[PDB]
Amino acid sequence: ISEGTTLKDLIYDMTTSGSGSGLPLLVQRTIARTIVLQESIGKGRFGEVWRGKWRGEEVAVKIFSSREERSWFREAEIYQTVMLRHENILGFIAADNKDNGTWTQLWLVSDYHEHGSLFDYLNRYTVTVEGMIKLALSTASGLAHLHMEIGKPAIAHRDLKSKNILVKKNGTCCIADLGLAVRHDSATDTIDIHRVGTKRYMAPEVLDDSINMKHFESFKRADIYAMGLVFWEIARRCSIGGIHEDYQLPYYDLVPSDPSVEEMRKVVCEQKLRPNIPNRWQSCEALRVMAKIMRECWYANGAARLTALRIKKTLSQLSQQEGI
Amino acid sequence: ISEGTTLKDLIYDMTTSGSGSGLPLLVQRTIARTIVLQESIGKGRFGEVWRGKWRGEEVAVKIFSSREERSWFREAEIYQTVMLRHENILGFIAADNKDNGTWTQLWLVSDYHEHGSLFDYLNRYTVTVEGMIKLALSTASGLAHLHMEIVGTQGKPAIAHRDLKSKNILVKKNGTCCIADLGLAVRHDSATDTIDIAPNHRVGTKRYMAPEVLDDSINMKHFESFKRADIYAMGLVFWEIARRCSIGGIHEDYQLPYYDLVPSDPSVEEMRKVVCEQKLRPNIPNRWQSCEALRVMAKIMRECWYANGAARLTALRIKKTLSQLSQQEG
Amino acid sequence: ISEGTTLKDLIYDMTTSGSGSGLPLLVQRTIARTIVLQESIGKGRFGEVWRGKWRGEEVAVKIFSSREERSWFREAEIYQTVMLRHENILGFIAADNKDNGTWTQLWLVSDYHEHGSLFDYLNRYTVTVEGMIKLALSTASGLAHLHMEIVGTQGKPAIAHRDLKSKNILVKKNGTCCIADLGLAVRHDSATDTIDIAPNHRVGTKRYMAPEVLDDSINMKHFESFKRADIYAMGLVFWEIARRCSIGGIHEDYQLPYYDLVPSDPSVEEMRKVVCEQKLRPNIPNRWQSCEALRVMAKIMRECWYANGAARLTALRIKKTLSQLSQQEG
Amino acid sequence: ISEGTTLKDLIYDMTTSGSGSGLPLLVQRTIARTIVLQESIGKGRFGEVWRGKWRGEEVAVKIFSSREERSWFREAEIYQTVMLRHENILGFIAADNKDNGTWTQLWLVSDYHEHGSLFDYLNRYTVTVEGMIKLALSTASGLAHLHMEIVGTQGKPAIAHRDLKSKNILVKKNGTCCIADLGLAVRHDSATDTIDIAPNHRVGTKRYMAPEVLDDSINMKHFESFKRADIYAMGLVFWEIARRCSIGGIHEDYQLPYYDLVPSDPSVEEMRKVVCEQKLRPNIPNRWQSCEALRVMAKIMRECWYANGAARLTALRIKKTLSQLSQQEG
Amino acid sequence: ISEGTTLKDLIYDMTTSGSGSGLPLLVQRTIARTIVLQESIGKGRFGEVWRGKWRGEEVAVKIFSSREERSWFREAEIYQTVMLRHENILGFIAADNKDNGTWTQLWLVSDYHEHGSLFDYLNRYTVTVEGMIKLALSTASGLAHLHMEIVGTQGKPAIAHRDLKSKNILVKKNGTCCIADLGLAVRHDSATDTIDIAPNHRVGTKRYMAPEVLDDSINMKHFESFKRADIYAMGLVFWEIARRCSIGGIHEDYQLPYYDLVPSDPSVEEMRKVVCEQKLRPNIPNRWQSCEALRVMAKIMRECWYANGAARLTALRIKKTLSQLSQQEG
C-alpha cells in the first residue's frame, strides 16, 4: 500500500475490478498490523470489537480470544471463500494473526458504523414511518442475499438479532457476525455443520429441539422467525405523531433477562405466545404491512413462514408507494 | 492450515471446489505430520491401519512398511490421479512420506469408520433383512462405480479392485459400506486400450481368488477378465452377509467362504482343487428360500460363482436388481 | 530501458500497444530517477511543476510536497488504473516515489507543452475566431471524454474533474488544449453505482465553484451533480477565452471570471453572495453579437451558467455544437 | 518421482494425458542419472545403445560420443518439441547431459525392445506370410505418421527420416515394428514453407541412399524430395523382409540390399554405378509370385524403386494397400 | 543454448513456433557473446559489418560505434517489435550490448550473404535478362512488404526505408535480394494516423534523395510522402541493375546514378540543381529498347522518376508488372 493510499481506494478497488474476491493477504496483513486502535465498542462470545483507524480513516476491529480461534476462522472463511459482499452485510476488509500458542492474536477488520447496533440505535432513537421501512427493507435485503444461492452458496445466519445488526449513516442496515453461519452446497446437498444462538430469539423448532438439521431449509426458517422479532423491535419505535412505545426486547414481559432454554420453550412452544402486536399498529398502511409480516414469520410451523426474498419484495413494494 | 481450521472445513473445500482434485500436497503433508495416532485398528499385506486424530477429529491412518512402498504409491496414485471419490468408497484425505532408506515412513490418511471392516462387523453382529440389503446394495454400488468408465475431464478410467473381501470393506454409522484398499487395483484407458498392472502376476487373498485366477487360465489382456474376478469374490462376500441375516432368531455363525473345505491361510493349490476341480462353491442354506430377499441374494451368488467369467452378472446389474429389492422394503 | 531508446519510442510503444497499458513500473521508475530537471514552470496546492529533460527530450515533472501525498496518489491512480488516454488530456508518462517519512519525494511525469496553461496563454495573446474555436472545441472534447463512461476492456469509468479552470488547462503548439490535474477527480462505476471519493467536502478553486457547490445544496449522492459543476466552470473558461478573441483589433484585456465582483483569492462566502444571492454571472459583452462564432459561444456560456445544474448543457452537447461551428469554416 | 513410482506409472501418465506431451526435464534428469546400465546392445555413427534398468524395469539408453552432440540434440529436439508419439515409433522417455567440455556425456532414453533391430530379427528368424505383413504394415504406418503433417495442437510438422534401414527399425514382442533414430531427420513447416536443416551435404547409410541422392541430382529445396528418398529405402527394407518369408520351408538367407553387387561398406561411387548407371535393383525372386501377399509386396517394391522419385508410391499409399492385404486375413 | 544446437535450429524455432517475433533475449545475448568474428565486410554511417561464425556457421555482425547508439536501437526496435520477417528483407537474428559509457559495445546479428551488397555484386558481375528480373522483382517484393500495412496482431505497420540504394541491398546465393539497414526507417500506425519518426529532418544518402526531399518541399505529415521517395530511389537502383544486363556481350560499366552529373559524395545543393532545377535523370540507354525486359524496366524507371511523387508507381504495382514479365520467360 503506497503513500497517499486511503481505505476508500482499497475498498473501491476490490468492489469494482476485484471480481468478487477481496484484498490480497499481504495487503490485509499490512492494514491489520498498521491500524491504530482507539477504544472498545462492544463484546460478545467471540471477544471484543474496537473502533480503530487506518491512516486516519475509521474502521472496526474484532479481536478474538485465543481460545475462540474457531469463530475467528469460521467467520473469515465464510467471508473470503464465498466472496459474499452486499450493501446489507457488514463489509469485510481483512483478517490477520500474530503471536504463537497461548498469546496468538486473531483479528478481523471491517467497515466502521458510528451508529452502532440496531439495538443501541433503537434505544437511542424513535423513527419515521419511512425510517422504519428503510431499516426493515435493508435487513430483509441482506438476509435475502445470505439465504440466496448462486456464485455463492446459501447461508443461514443462525443468530440474528438487533445486536447483530448495524445501522449506517443513511439509516440502512447490514447483518453482522457470521461466526455461527452454516453453508449449503446444493450441487452436493451438503452443509458443513448443537443448538446455538441467543436464547431469546431461538425459533420454536429450535427450542423444543424438533428441528430437522438435515434439511438446510430448517435454518433459513429459524432465521426468518428471529428477523420477525427484530421487525417487532423496530415498529415499536416507529413514532407517528409523538406516539410510540419504549424500546423493548422481544418477550421482555414474559421472561427474565438472560432467558434459559426452558423458560423460553414454555412461553414460545407451550403457551404458544408471541410478542404483542399493538392495537395502534393498524393506524397506517406501513404499520399494517409490518404487523402482517411479523405474523407470517412467527408461525409455529417453519415451512409456513415467509421467505426473506418474499419479505424483501413486499417491503420493497411498500417503499415505492411511499416515494422513499 | 491456520488456527481454527477444522477437518470439516478442509473436506468441504475440496468437495465443493471446481476441481475433483483434492487437498494441496503442502496441506496433506501438514495434516499427516500433525496427526496424533491413537492405537492400531488392523493389519494386512500393506502394513497397519491406525485410528488417529487431527486437531481432535478422528481419522484413519494406513502406515506402510518400507518394503511395501509400491502398494503405498499405487493406491495414492489411483486416488489422486483420477479424483476418485464416491459415497461408497473409502474417503481419501492425504498421503505423505518421511525418512530415508530403510526407515522411510509411508502414510495414507482417510475417513474413520468406528465400525471397522465388514468382516469384524459380521463377526460382531447378525443383521436385519433390511440391513443385509443396505450392505449388499452399497457394496455393489461402489464396485459399480469403480468398474464404471466416464470419458471426459472430470471422468475416470475403469478400475478393477483385484482383492475384494469382507476385510477390505468398511461399514459406516448408517449401515452402508465402502470399498477400500486400492493397492492392487488396475486401470483401463479405453481410448488407448491400455491396462496398467503394478503386480502383473496373480495377486490377492487366496481364499477369494476366482477360478480363472486359480488355474491361471485367465486372460490378463482383456480388462474384463479382472472385473469378472471381482464379481466372483463379491459373491463370496454376499454369502458371508446373508449367513448372518437373522430372521426370527435363526441365523448361521459367521464363517469365511470355504471355511469347511480348506485350512486357514489356504494355498493356491488347496483352493484350486476345491474351486476348479471339485467345482465346489459355498453351501447355499436351505432356509434361504424363506423370504424374497434371501432368494434374490442366493440367486445373485450363483450368477456370480459361474466357472465361466463371461457368464457372471455385472456390478451394475447386481446394483440394479438389488436396488429393486430395496425399493419394496421400508 | 536500453541505450539509444528515446522518449518518442516509449510513447509510441504504449500508444501503439494493442493492450491498453502504459509503461512498466520499472521503466517509469528509471525514467523518473534519470530525468534532469531544468527549472520551475508553475505552482499550485499540490506542489510545483518543472520542465525537465529525459535523455535530451523535454518533459514535465510535477513534484509534490510530502504532506500532499494523497493528491499525488489520487492523480496517478486515476491515470494508470483507467488507461485514460486522450488527445485533449495531459499525457501521463510515469509516477514514482523516493525517500522516507518527512522527506518522501513524490513525482509525476507527463508531456511537456512549451505554451503553458491556457491562463498564461490568454494573458500573453489574443486569438483568431478560428483560434478561439480550436481552444473551446478541444477543451469540450476532453471534458466530454472524462465524463463519458465506457463499458469494456479498453473502457473507462465516467470521471468528473472537480476543479476545471484556465490554469488547469494547457495549450499545445497546434493551438489545441488538454485538461490537466486530476488530483480531485471522482470516478463512477455505473455497474455498481458507486463513487470514488466517498465522504467529500467542497474542493476546488473558489472563484470557479458552481452555485450548488457554494451554497452547499449540491447532492453528492448523484454523480451527475459533479459533471454539472464541471460545465459551469467550463463556461467561465469559455468566457475568459472569447474575451481575448480579437476581431479587427477589438478585444478586452485578459480577466479572470468575477474579476470585478470579488477580491483576489475570493472566500467561499464572498463568492456565494455574488453567485448564489445576487445571482450574477460574468458580463457577456455587447460586441459578442458581432459574428456567428461569438454568438454561439455566448449562447453556450449562458446554458452553462444556469443556477439549476440539471438545466445546463452537457459536455458532449457543447462538443457537438462547437464541432458544428468549427465545421462552418473548415 | 517419489518412492514406489515405477516406469510403467510414468509412461501411463504421459500416455493417458490430453497434454500429448512428455515428462518434466527435472524428472528426465532424475531418471537418466538414476538408471543402472546393464550392458551394450549395439553401435552406430551416434555412439552406443545400452540396455539399462530404472528401478528394476528395463529401458534402452543411447549414449553419444562428445563429438556427436549434434545428433544427440537433433534427435531429442525432434522428439520433444514436436510431441512425437506413435505406436510404430520408438518411444522416447528422456534426454540428459552431464559433464563439461571434452567429457560431456549426452544421453537419450527410450523403451526397451528385447528383439532388437529388424536387421538382427531377420538374421535370427524367418517369417510367416502373416508375420511379414505385420512387419511391413507397421513400418509403413510409422513412416506414414512421420511424413504426415497435422495442423491441430496435437499435430506436428512433416518429417523425413533420411536414414531408414533394417538396422534402424525395432521389432516388438507382438511382431510389430517402430522406426528409430531421428538424428538426421528433417522438418517441414508448410505454413512457412521452410526446412529444418542446411541440406548442404549428403547423409545416411550409403547402401540405402536413393538414386537422386547418389548422383546428387536431388532438389533439396522441395521437402518432397526427402519423403521420396525415404520410400526408396523403405522398399529395400520390404525386400529384406519378404526374402525371409518362409512358405513351406522355402526361403532365402538373410541378405542386405545389393549384397551381391557391391562390397561391405559401399562407397558413394560404387553404389552410384550400380544404382544410377547400371540401373540395377535388388533381384525380385521368381517364387514371390507364389501367393497374393508376396505379389503385393513385390509390386510395392518396384513402385518404390523407380529412378524418378515423383513416380514412387507414398507412405500413406503403401499403408493403405498393405492394410488391405492385411484385413483380408486379420 | 545446449550442446549440439545449431543456428538453423534456432532460426527454425523462432520462424515456426516462437510467438515473440524472435529468439529470447537471453538466447540472443548468448549467441552474440559467443560468436567469433572473422573479418570486416563493410562500413557505413552506423559502424562496420563483419562476417562472423557462431559454432562454425557463418553469420553477419553489425558493430556500432558508441556514438551511434540511436541507429542501433532504432533498427533493432523496428525488427523485434513487429516480427518483420520476409524473404526479401535481411534476416534479423539478435541484438546485444556490452560495456559502459564510452566503450559500450552495440551489436546486431543477421544472416550472412557471401555475395555482399548489390553494389559489390554489380561491380563484380554482369547479368542475364533473367538474372536482372530476379534482382529487380525480389527488391520490389521486399520494398512492397515494408510499405504494406497489415492490421492483425500477426500483422505490422507500414514502414518506409528512407535510405534505399545498391549498397543497402544484399544478394543471396540464389540471385535474389533482400533490403537491409532499417536504422532510418519510419513507422506508420494507420489506426492512430501517427508517424513514428526517428530523425525528422532529411536523412539518407544524398545521391539517391528524391526531388521533394532535395528542395525540401516534401510533406512529412503524410506518410505517403516517404513511400514515394523510396520508389524514386528504387528506380535509380533498377537503373544500376539494367546497366549491367549483358545481352550478347553488350553492357555498360557499373556506375552509380548521376555519376556523370555530380562529384563523389555529392552535396545536397549539387544534387538539388541537377535533379530539381535542370530536371535531369539518369540516361536511359538507347539499346534498352532491344528486348521486352529492358523496355519494361525502362518504363518503370521513368514512372519512378517523376518530379511529382503522387504520380509515381507503387511498390506493389512494380512487383505485379515485374512479376508478370518474369512469367513471360520462366
Side-chain angles (χ1 to χ4, degrees), chain C residues 276-316:
Chain C
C276 294
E277 281 171 48
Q278 301 171 57
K279 302 176 184 178
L280 295 174
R281 256 46 158 179
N283 181 66
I284 298 183
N286 199 56
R287 81 182 188 86
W288 288 7
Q289 289 298 166
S290 299
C291 58
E292 173 75 320
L294 270 297
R295 266 132 51 194
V296 184
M297 285 288 282
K299 175 77 178 304
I300 302 178
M301 301 174 58
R302 303 195 196 92
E303 316 187 86
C304 277
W305 300 337
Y306 290 158
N308 178 294
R312 304 164 188 157
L313 294 163
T314 63
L316 219 173

Side-chain angles (χ1 to χ4, degrees), chain A residues 14 20-23 28 62 64 71-95 108-111 113 145-146 151-153 155 157 164 166 174-179 181 183:
Chain A
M14 67 190 280
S21 36
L23 307 171
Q28 289 185 49
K62 186 191 283 187
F64 296 68
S71 324
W72 170 76
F73 179 86
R74 223 273 171 305
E75 174 154 31
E77 163 76 342
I78 281 166
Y79 266 115
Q80 303 188 306
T81 247
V82 182
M83 330 151 294
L84 189 211
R85 189 85 176 180
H86 184 89
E87 181 206 312
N88 302 304
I89 293 196
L90 184 53
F92 181 83
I93 294 179
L108 246 38
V109 185
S110 72
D111 293 320
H113 298 299
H145 188 282
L146 269 168
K152 47 90 73 200
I155 309 172
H157 190 112
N164 285 359
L166 307 160
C174 52
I175 315 292
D177 201 303
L178 312 181
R183 280 179 297 176

